[PDB]
Design a protein around this ligand. Structure first.
Ligand SMILES: C[C@@H](O)[C@H]1C(=O)N2C(C(=O)O)=C(S[C@@H]3CN[C@H](C(=O)N(C)C)C3)[C@H](C)[C@H]12
Ligand code: NA
Ligand code: NA
Ligand code: NA
Ligand code: NA
Ligand code: NA
Ligand code: NA
Ligand code: NA
Length: 270
C-alpha cells in the first residue's frame, strides 16, 4: 500500500534540481518499521539540530542525579553568544537546568547550549559520547556554538546523517535509553519548539501533532529539521530532512524542507 521507493526518489530528485542543492531524508514508521531514505547516509551539517539531543543528554544525566533538572545555574558577567533570546533575559534570576534545556531546544538558544555543554555534558566531546552511548556511531559534535555552524562542504566536523538523526530520535522518543518520565519530558519539549513552523510542521495537516528541532547554519544554503509526527490514529513517524547548497552565499529554503517532508510522508500512504 505504500508508494514505490523509486517514485519517492524521483520526486525528491526533481525537488533537488529546483532547489539547486542536496536534500537528504530518512523516515521511520514506528508501527510497521517501514523506512525510506534518500541520501540517507550522506553527511550534512547539524547546525542547531544537535540541541534536541543535548536536551536528551541532560535528561539522561538527571535520570541518575536526583534533582538535577531543578538546579539553578547563574552566569553573571558571562558574554552571551549571538541568538540567546531566553538566556539574555535571565541573568539576574539565573535559570534551572530544565529551563536551559527547554530554551536551547525550543528557541535554539546558544547561551543555553554552551552553558549546558560546559557545565553538565562535557563539551562537544561529551555530546558525542552521549550519542555513542545510545548506539549512534555517526553523529559528531566537534566545536562549540557558534563555530559549529560553518557548514563548509567536505568538512565532517559537526555533522550527522539523516538516517542517524532519525534513528537516534526514534531511540530517544520510543526506546529504552530514557525512562518514562524522561521520554515524556523530551517529547513535551520537542512539541513546544517555536522555530519550526515553516518546515516539517508546514507539511502536515493541522490536526497532526509534531515535535521537532530545526537547524539553520546561515551559510551554504544549509538548514534542516527533524521530528516525531503523530498522524491521526496512526503510529508516529520519525523524519529527518537535511539540506545544503554548494555556494557559500546562497540562502536556505524553508519551503524546500516542507516540500521534501510532504513527499516523504505522502509515500507512506497513511
Ligand atoms: C545562530 C545559529 O545558532 C542558528 C541555528 O542553527 N539556529 C536556528 C534554528 O535552529 O533554526 C535559527 S532560525 C531563527 C530562530 N528564530 C527565528 C524563528 O524562530 N523563526 C520562526 C523565524 C529564526 C538561528 C539562525 C540559529
Ligand atoms: Na504520483
Ligand atoms: Na558541518
Ligand atoms: Na528526569
Ligand atoms: Na526555558
Ligand atoms: Na559560524
Ligand atoms: Na556538501
Ligand atoms: Na525556495
Amino acid at each position: 500500500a505504500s508508494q514505490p521507493p523509486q517514485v519517492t526518489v524521483d520526486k525528491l530528485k526533481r525537488l533537488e534540481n529546483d532547489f539547486g542543492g542536496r536534500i537528504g531524508v530518512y523516515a521511520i514508521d514506528t508501527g510497521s518499521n517501514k523506512t525510506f531514505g534518500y541520501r540517507a547516509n550522506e553527511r550534512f551539517p547539524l547546525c542547531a539540530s544537535f540541541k534536541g539531543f543535548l536536551a536528551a543528554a541532560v535528561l539522561s544525566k538527571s535520570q541518575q542525579q536526583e534533582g538535577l533538572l531543578n538546579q539553578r545555574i547563574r552566569y553573571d558577567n558571562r558574554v552571551m553568544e549571538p541568538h540567546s533570546p531566553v538566556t539574555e533575559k535571565q541573568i539576574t534570576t539565573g535559570m534551572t537546568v530544565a529551563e536551559l534545556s527547554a530554551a536551547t531546544l525550543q528557541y535554539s538558544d546558544n547561551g543555553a547550549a554552551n552553558l549546558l555543554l560546559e557545565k553538565l555534558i562535557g563539551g562537544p566531546e561529551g555530546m558525542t559520547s552521549f550519542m555513542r552511548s545510545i548506539g549512534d556511531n555517526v553523529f559528531r559534535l566537534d566545536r562549540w556554538e557558534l563555530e559549529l555552524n560553518s557548514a563548509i562542504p567536505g568538512d565532517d566536523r559537526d555533522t550527522s546523517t539523516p538516517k542517524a538523526v532519525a534513528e537516534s530520535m526514534q531511540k530517544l522518543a520510543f526506546g529504552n535509553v530514557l525512562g518514562l518520565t524522561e521520554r515524556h519530558q523530551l517529547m513535551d519539549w520537542f512539541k513546544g519548539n517555536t522555530t519550526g513552523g515553516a518546515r516539517i510542521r508546514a507539511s502536515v495537516p493541522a490536526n497532526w501533532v509534531v515535535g521537532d528541532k530545526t537547524g539553520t547554519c546561515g551559510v551554504y544554503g544549509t538548514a534542516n529539521d527533524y521530528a516525531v509526527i503523530w498522524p491521526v490514529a496512526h503510529a508516529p513517524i520519525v523524519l529527518a530532512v537535511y539540506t545544503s547548497k554548494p555556494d557559500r552565499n546562497s540562502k536556505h529554503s524553508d519551503a524546500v524542507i516542507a516540500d521534501a517532508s510532504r513527499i516523504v510522508l505522502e509515500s507512506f500512504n497513511i
